[PDB]
Design a binder for this molecule. Structure first.
Ligand SMILES: Nc1ncnc2c1ncn2[C@@H]1O[C@H](COP(=O)(O)OP(=O)(O)O)[C@@H](O)[C@H]1O
Ligand SMILES: [Mg+2]
Ligand SMILES: [Zn+2]
Lengths: 238, 202
């Protein structure tokens, strides 16, 4: 029904020129400052308050609360596109994942061929190279729902519930992108994980191993892969 | 199935058990409760133990890739590459079995006095004979078998007799007449009851 390029421009516009007087009355760009902070890798989570979005685009807040997973992706796309122009220095590579991102970026530049059109599969998945994560803070105009009454009519919608936490698992690594290396080629293979289970890949799909028609068995490894801190809780009605 | 002897256990540990394999003529040599002494070879045996992390696969070294619609992926790809887990467990393949502490030095199907007598060396049986002719053998065995226990001579005699036992018999109608002496020791704390039991058990 709607055009997501225009929605991405809308969310870019919101992120770039929304301001508030939070800093002791001084007018700050609430989200541009954070784009700076997480372009320099000093911040991971960006909590996009939807009350701020509603100040100037309540239709956008309605669209967000009605799909809420398309728009989390859109907001992540938009912030990922805005980060390069908010970067005012060079990240200190505080992490080990950062080294993998930097090496992948540098290799991509090195073999660029800017005008050559590469295959849709011959690219880094977005999730592999983000390092930030974007979350919504529900509009206060949404009254909290009761756990019993969150049903199939609210699948895909952003809802707010409250209850007692009864049970929390331990924090453990959830695979987001499974990275493989091959025994023939030297390319990496990426398998973004959406399901609760996945079948690990066997053969590599890289260009060289297709040209050579070689075996090209690929090996799943934790070192280049993307994990996220994962935790499952049970929450209960008041 | 055997397990390591209690004089071999490290601290805080449960005895390790391994399953030993007996073959053609050694096959029925070791019975339950025996402290036996197996000579043979430690071997690996393919095992079925998974759901752990996958590890140690074996696949063909032929560089082979499935075509469109027959891609070497999933169950089909694993079957086609012939991949199989390499899981092993340790088993003992025993060629010979013998007691660790043998009773005789002469031999080891049924048991008669003459069979026992042949089963032992001439020195061992001359010893057996000379204590069988030994007057005061009752007291000699009592003292030789509970050396550290003072007093309780009646208990020593009773336990010795229980060790020898009586003659089991079966009536013509069918009832069995018991021939095993059962002995109970009742007494005050620290009167060496547990010591009597330990003496017999060792
Ligand atoms: N008549 C005895 N002669 C030698 N030792 C004795 C005697 N009575 C008790 N003891 C000693 O007392 C200790 C505890 O005896 P124990 O066998 O634990 O007694 P119980 O289990 O009957 O209470 C033993 O180590 C034993 O050496
Ligand atoms: Mg006792
Ligand atoms: Zn390859």
């Amino acid at each position: 029904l709607k055009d997501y390029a225009l929605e991405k421009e809308k969310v870019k516009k919101f992120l770039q020129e929304f301001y508030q007087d939070d800093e002791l009355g001084k007018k700050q760009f609430k989200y541009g400052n954070q784009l700076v902070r997480l372009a320099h890798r000093e911040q991971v989570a960006l909590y996009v308050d939807l009350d701020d979005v509603a100040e100037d685009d309540p239709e956008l807040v309605d669209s967000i609360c009605e799909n809420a997973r398309r728009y989390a992706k859109l907001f992540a796309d938009a912030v990922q596109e805005l980060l390069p122009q908010y970067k005012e220095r060079e990240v200190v590579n505080k992490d080990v994942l950062d080294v993998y991102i930097e090496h992948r970026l540098m290799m991509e530049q090195r073999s660029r061929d800017p005008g050559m059109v590469r295959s849709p599969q011959n690219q880094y998945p977005a999730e592999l190279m983000r390092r930030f994560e974007l979350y919504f803070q529900g509009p206060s105009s949404n009254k909290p729902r009761v756990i019993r009454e969150v049903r199939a009519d609210s699948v895909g919608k952003l809802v707010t519930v409250r209850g007692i936490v009864t049970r929390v698992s331990e924090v453990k690594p959830k695979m987001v992108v499974a990275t493989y290396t091959c025994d023939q080629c030297g390319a990496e293979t990426y398998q973004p994980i959406q399901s609760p289970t996945f079948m690990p890949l066997i053969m590599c799909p890289s260009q060289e191993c297709q040209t050579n028609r070689s075996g090209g068995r690929l090996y799943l490894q934790t070192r280049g892969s993307r994990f996220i801190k994962f935790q499952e809780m049970k929450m209960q009605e008041h | 199935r055997i397990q390591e002897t209690q004089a071999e256990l490290p601290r805080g540990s449960i005895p390790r058990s391994l399953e030993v394999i007996l073959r053609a003529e050694a096959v029925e040599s070791a019975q339950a409760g025996d402290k036996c002494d197996f000579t043979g070879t430690l071997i690996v045996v393919p095992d079925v133990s998974k759901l752990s992390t996958p590890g140690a696969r074996a696949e063909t070294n032929s560089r082979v890739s499935g075509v469109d619609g027959y891609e070497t992926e999933g169950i089909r790809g694993l079957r086609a590459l012939g991949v199989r887990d390499l899981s092993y467990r340790l088993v003992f393949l025993a060629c010979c079995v013998a007691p660790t502490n043998p009773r005789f030095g002469g031999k080891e199907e049924e048991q008669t006095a003459e069979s026992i007598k042949n089963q032992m060396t001439v020195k061992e049986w001359e010893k057996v004979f000379e204590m069988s002719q030994d007057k005061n053998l009752y007291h000699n065995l009592c003292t030789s078998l509970f050396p550290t226990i003072h007093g309780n001579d009646e208990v020593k005699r009773g336990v010795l007799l229980m060790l020898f036992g009586g003659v089991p018999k079966t009536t013509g109608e069918g009832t069995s007449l018991r021939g095993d002496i059962n002995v109970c020791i009742v007494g005050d704390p620290s009167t060496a009851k547990s010591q009597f039991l330990k003496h017999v058990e060792e």
